[PDB]
Design an enzyme around this catalytic site. Sequence first.
Site, PDB file in Angstrom:
ATOM      1  N   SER A  97      -6.004 -22.676   2.872  1.00  0.00           N
ATOM      2  CA  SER A  97      -4.699 -22.051   3.014  1.00  0.00           C
ATOM      3  C   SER A  97      -4.435 -21.693   4.463  1.00  0.00           C
ATOM      4  O   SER A  97      -3.418 -22.100   5.031  1.00  0.00           O
ATOM      5  CB  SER A  97      -4.624 -20.818   2.133  1.00  0.00           C
ATOM      6  OG  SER A  97      -5.191 -21.103   0.883  1.00  0.00           O
TER       7      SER A  97
ATOM      8  N   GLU B   1       0.866  -1.169   0.000  1.00  0.00           N
ATOM      9  CA  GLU B   1       0.000   0.000   0.000  1.00  0.00           C
ATOM     10  C   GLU B   1       0.907   1.224   0.000  1.00  0.00           C
ATOM     11  O   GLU B   1       1.594   1.479   0.988  1.00  0.00           O
ATOM     12  CB  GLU B   1      -0.887  -0.039   1.234  1.00  0.00           C
ATOM     13  CG  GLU B   1      -2.309  -0.367   0.926  1.00  0.00           C
ATOM     14  CD  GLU B   1      -2.986  -1.100   2.075  1.00  0.00           C
ATOM     15  OE1 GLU B   1      -2.597  -0.867   3.227  1.00  0.00           O
ATOM     16  OE2 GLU B   1      -3.891  -1.926   1.824  1.00  0.00           O
TER      17      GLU B   1
ATOM     18  N   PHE C 148      -5.068  -6.014   6.164  1.00  0.00           N
ATOM     19  CA  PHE C 148      -5.052  -4.661   5.646  1.00  0.00           C
ATOM     20  C   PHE C 148      -5.713  -4.582   4.284  1.00  0.00           C
ATOM     21  O   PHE C 148      -6.463  -3.645   4.004  1.00  0.00           O
ATOM     22  CB  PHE C 148      -3.616  -4.182   5.544  1.00  0.00           C
ATOM     23  CG  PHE C 148      -3.260  -3.152   6.538  1.00  0.00           C
ATOM     24  CD1 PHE C 148      -3.036  -3.507   7.850  1.00  0.00           C
ATOM     25  CD2 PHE C 148      -3.104  -1.845   6.158  1.00  0.00           C
ATOM     26  CE1 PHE C 148      -2.693  -2.584   8.761  1.00  0.00           C
ATOM     27  CE2 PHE C 148      -2.752  -0.908   7.070  1.00  0.00           C
ATOM     28  CZ  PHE C 148      -2.547  -1.274   8.377  1.00  0.00           C
TER      29      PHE C 148
ATOM     30  N   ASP D 244     -10.152   4.397  -1.994  1.00  0.00           N
ATOM     31  CA  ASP D 244      -9.497   3.142  -2.339  1.00  0.00           C
ATOM     32  C   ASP D 244     -10.279   2.480  -3.464  1.00  0.00           C
ATOM     33  O   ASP D 244     -11.066   3.143  -4.147  1.00  0.00           O
ATOM     34  CB  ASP D 244      -9.366   2.213  -1.127  1.00  0.00           C
ATOM     35  CG  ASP D 244     -10.635   2.134  -0.303  1.00  0.00           C
ATOM     36  OD1 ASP D 244     -11.440   3.078  -0.374  1.00  0.00           O
ATOM     37  OD2 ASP D 244     -10.818   1.142   0.439  1.00  0.00           O
TER      38      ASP D 244
ATOM     39  N   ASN E 109      -1.473 -22.954  -3.258  1.00  0.00           N
ATOM     40  CA  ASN E 109      -2.922 -22.853  -3.273  1.00  0.00           C
ATOM     41  C   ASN E 109      -3.348 -21.399  -3.322  1.00  0.00           C
ATOM     42  O   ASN E 109      -4.267 -21.040  -4.052  1.00  0.00           O
ATOM     43  CB  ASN E 109      -3.485 -23.555  -2.033  1.00  0.00           C
ATOM     44  CG  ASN E 109      -4.983 -23.643  -2.041  1.00  0.00           C
ATOM     45  OD1 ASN E 109      -5.559 -24.448  -2.763  1.00  0.00           O
ATOM     46  ND2 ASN E 109      -5.627 -22.834  -1.224  1.00  0.00           N
TER      47      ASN E 109
ATOM     48  N   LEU F 236      -8.716   3.920   6.069  1.00  0.00           N
ATOM     49  CA  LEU F 236     -10.084   4.290   5.717  1.00  0.00           C
ATOM     50  C   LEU F 236     -10.696   5.186   6.785  1.00  0.00           C
ATOM     51  O   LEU F 236     -10.888   4.758   7.928  1.00  0.00           O
ATOM     52  CB  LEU F 236     -10.915   3.020   5.514  1.00  0.00           C
ATOM     53  CG  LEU F 236     -12.428   2.971   5.324  1.00  0.00           C
ATOM     54  CD1 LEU F 236     -12.803   1.827   4.432  1.00  0.00           C
ATOM     55  CD2 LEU F 236     -13.031   2.701   6.685  1.00  0.00           C
TER      56      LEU F 236
END
EC number: 3.2.1.17
Lengths: 462, 308
Positions: free
Chosen positions: A112, A11, A99, A20, A127, A32
């Site tokens: 995962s 970011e 995030f 965003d 994966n 945000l």
Amino acid sequence: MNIFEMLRIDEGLRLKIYKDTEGYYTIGIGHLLTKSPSLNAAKSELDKAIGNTNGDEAEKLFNQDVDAAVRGILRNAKLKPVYDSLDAVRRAALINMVFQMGETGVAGFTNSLRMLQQKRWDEAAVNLAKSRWYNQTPNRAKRVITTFRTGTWDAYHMEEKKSGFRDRKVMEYENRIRAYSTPDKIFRYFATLKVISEPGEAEVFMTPEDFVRSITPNQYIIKRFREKFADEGSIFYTLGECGLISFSDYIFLTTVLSTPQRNFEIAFKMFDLNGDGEVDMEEFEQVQSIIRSQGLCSALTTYFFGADLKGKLTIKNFLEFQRKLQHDVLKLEFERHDPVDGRITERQFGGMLLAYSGVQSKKLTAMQRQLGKGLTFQEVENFFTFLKNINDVDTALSFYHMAGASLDKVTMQQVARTVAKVELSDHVCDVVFALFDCDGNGELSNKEFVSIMKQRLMRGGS
Amino acid sequence: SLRKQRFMQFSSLEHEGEYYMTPRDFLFSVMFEQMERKTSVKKLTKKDIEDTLSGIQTAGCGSTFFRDLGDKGLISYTEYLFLLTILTKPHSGFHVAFKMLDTDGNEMIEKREFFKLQKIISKQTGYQEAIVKEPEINTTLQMRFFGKRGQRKLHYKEFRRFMENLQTEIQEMEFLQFSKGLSFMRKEDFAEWLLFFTNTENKDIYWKNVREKLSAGESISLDEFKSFCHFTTHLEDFAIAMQMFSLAHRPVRLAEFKRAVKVATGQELSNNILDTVFKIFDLDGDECLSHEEFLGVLKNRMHRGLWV
């Protein structure tokens, strides 16, 4: 190196308010403000946890966010088991994902996530790479997935590398390679491939991305014993050989890239048997050699002249060869930058315009003043279609000057419409004008602008 | 500036310390560098203005516009420059200049933007006798282009037709001056034309070839001549095709020269012009033309001795 520096690379760090990917308002490092639609609530909300400026060291916001991210991770019944089992670094990767999409989205990678808890690093990395998440932001995801798979910051040290003096020195040396060395020495320097057909022997080859690196101012990695090194519709496959560029083809492409088409028409019609513009295999060799002043490979020669090597080349057909080759080279040169959703920085487009004017950082020095919004490929190629007519455009600009009209944006946009039959978007004008007015009035230094654009156009000099 | 020396050398009227040309003046100054008997400057009478209006309505609008007018006409110094540019570099993209002062995008201009239109195209003895300063006199071009009252408008079509006709008039007029009045230029007379403004260091070979090596043949007609003139304007595409023959270490023989012409201009030249150009500029006699020198004479003749 830590989560702050990591999440400062994935970011970007923005000082002024923005939105965003979804609609919501955002400032800082991916912070945000609120999901309301009104900008005014954002400013007033922003000031409630800063205390009344829309501005650097006031990066406590990232610090409070991470603390909320860690905390939200830990009261969440699906994120918490995994996080507690991960080391300092993999924890940073998971905070990074939170995030990017917030805990609810992250927590939805239930296999995962379950793999990372059973420490199956290679599985979870294989994966995770399969998902929309990765599809949408594949570069961020590869760093995160490396950081998951290996436990180390190695994914980011590679991109953390922005020092200007050691790096400029190699830029400067390399620029001189392009400008003053022989083609054999240039080709060998930038080519990355080797093809070994034992019948015959080892020969060095260039990938398209190598080739554009050759010619654009401002090392063997792989061997080939049917790969594809070039996009689905790419002029380079006509060269044969999977999209690779041999040495003979390097000579030939750099000749046809930077010759104006009128010269090829006149050259064709001069050595043509009947002067109508259609040149045979052998007559083509003197043409391209003559043009060089001011041993083509067997794939191309059949592509033009047919496999018997007796066909003929139309100036019309070849002129579309050139037009097509100029496109893909511009494409490649466009992507040699930061194509975030197909738009490069304003500051980089400025680096395409001056790539052949050498020590012109002084002009760009005052260009970053104004600046935001990327520039699409179509915006750029339109400017480069504008440069095709630069000798006609320089005529017009001098007239508007003597008649007293100013050389502001409407004039340039009008001139590109009138003599170059193409529409220059508004934004590329602001970029072009910020660079070349040089005095702050919205008026171009027409004689100067035409000088640098004459070198961009032909990749040459003066 | 040689153009101010040309204007002043041939101007025949003074008004308010500002000098003027009559179409008869303007023609002579285009084809001659100086004349044997200088002209008589006279103060601009008030009959002349009455006559400048008469000639407009009785004068050929075709390629005789200046010969018919004659002494009934007026051409300011700014106009003269403008007209010279039409004849010495007819390709200054007058179209895009016309289109920048375009009114309401209809590809036509009003009298007001005239002075600018001459000024942007023609720009980039008698210091103050010759300058850009604005006029209060109604000149011949202005009456013809935008009407006596000035209320007409000038379409680009009419303005292209006017440049072409102006070029055509000098070609038709120089034909007879150099053909001595006969209806066919001699090969020897065409050479005198071609080499009228040539004063370089090899004029002894050019002229020696004219006298010795070129004195018999089929004569050169008006339309054979015009077609050479219309070739001399396209010479830069010619110059390129010539350079490419040097970089090919190729001697330019006749068959090569014929080719360079069709590519530069799309048209082919009479046999008697080709033969004349070669006999003059084949210095060595190897039947190989010295294009760099032939190309220098062309530039002398195109520039008309004003350094354009």
